[PDB]
Design a binder for this molecule. Structure first.
Ligand SMILES: CNC(=O)[C@H]1Cc2c([nH]c3ccccc23)CN1C(=O)[C@@H](Cc1cccc(C)c1)NC(=O)c1ccc2[nH]ncc2c1
Ligand SMILES: [Cl-]
Ligand code: NA
Length: 270
């Protein structure tokens, strides 16, 4: 079934409609399950994933469930290529959503997007689960405007070394703390850093972090003490929150639980 019963979904119960997304991992199609329920069908391009390891871990990820986490309904592994059946989010990736000027966002909406993501990440943290590539491109927005965290943990199965090596051309350098870029030291605190950058993306309406700097320059300068400027739409109290994610010393950065409380405090003042 869809999130109930077998986690192996029968692809004969799926209809494959419009494409929602495409990249070096595969292609994402909108679909219906038993002609009633909307789904996003993420089909894994052969040659891109450690498929055995990925299927083993998908079974465990079936147990992750939270309102602000993109729901995994199941998988289709008895064919080539394999599919992941996931929650359909009608408004697409958060990065493009932020860049659409027609939305004319209020700052109250931007803070709520931060709350949404933070609640999802507090959940993952309580499960000792790392996202490992948190960023606006990896969040989705549903038909009601709710943001949910997507593709959490997926980078563990990507074979392309340009994307998993901290020196690779596809690595999330601009979302990584210095100890990741220097020593490959991953932890909850490197998710925390990325979340700070994600808040900066949100309040910048989707601008690229450190736009005037190359990947190599960014890595060098953030280690020296460069930090992202306060976006014009971010109040001092909002900037204080995202800035706290970027302390040089990882164990000085907050937890997602503390970040969420800070975000609620700012919301509660309206
Ligand atoms: C490298 N990415 C990729 O290759 C493809 C396919 C795919 C993903 N993740 C996968 C996992 C397994 C197989 C294929 C993929 C992720 N992916 C997407 O375009 C993402 C946006 C995105 C993120 C990072 C980097 C880039 C370049 C694009 N969008 C969506 O995923 C999406 C967009 C609209 C939606 N509406 N509802 C749900 C939904 C989902
Ligand atoms: Cl410090
Ligand atoms: Na810049």
């Amino acid at each position: 079934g869809l999130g109930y019963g077998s986690w192996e979904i029968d692809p004969k119960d799926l209809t494959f409609l419009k494409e929602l997304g495409t990249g070096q991992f595969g292609v994402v199609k909108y679909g219906k399950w038993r002609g009633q329920y909307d789904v996003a069908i993420k089909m894994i391009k052969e040659g891109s994933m450690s498929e055995d390891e990925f299927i083993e871990e998908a079974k465990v990820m079936m147990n992750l469930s939270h309102e602000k986490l993109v729901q995994l309904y199941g998988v289709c592994t008895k064919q080539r290529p394999i599919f992941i059946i996931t929650e359909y989010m009608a408004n697409g990736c958060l990065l493009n959503y932020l860049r659409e000027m027609r939305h004319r966002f209020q700052t109250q909406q931007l803070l709520e997007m931060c709350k949404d993501v933070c609640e999802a990440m507090e959940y993952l943290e309580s499960k000792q689960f790392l996202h490992r590539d948190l960023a606006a491109r990896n969040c989705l927005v549903n038909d009601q405007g709710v943001v949910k965290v997507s593709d959490f943990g997926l980078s563990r199965y990507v074979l392309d070394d340009e994307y998993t090596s901290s020196v690779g051309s596809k690595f999330p350098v601009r979302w990584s703390p210095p100890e990741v870029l220097m020593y490959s030291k991953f932890s909850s605190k490197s998710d925390i850093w990325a979340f700070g950058v994600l808040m900066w993306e949100i309040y910048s309406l989707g601008k690229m972090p450190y736009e005037r700097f190359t990947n190599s320059e960014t890595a060098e300068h953030i280690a020296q003490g460069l930090r992202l400027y306060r976006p014009h739409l971010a109040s001092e109290k909002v900037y204080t929150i995202m800035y706290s994610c970027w302390h040089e010393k990882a164990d000085e950065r907050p937890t997602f639980k503390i970040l969420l409380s800070n975000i609620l405090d700012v919301m509660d003042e309206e």
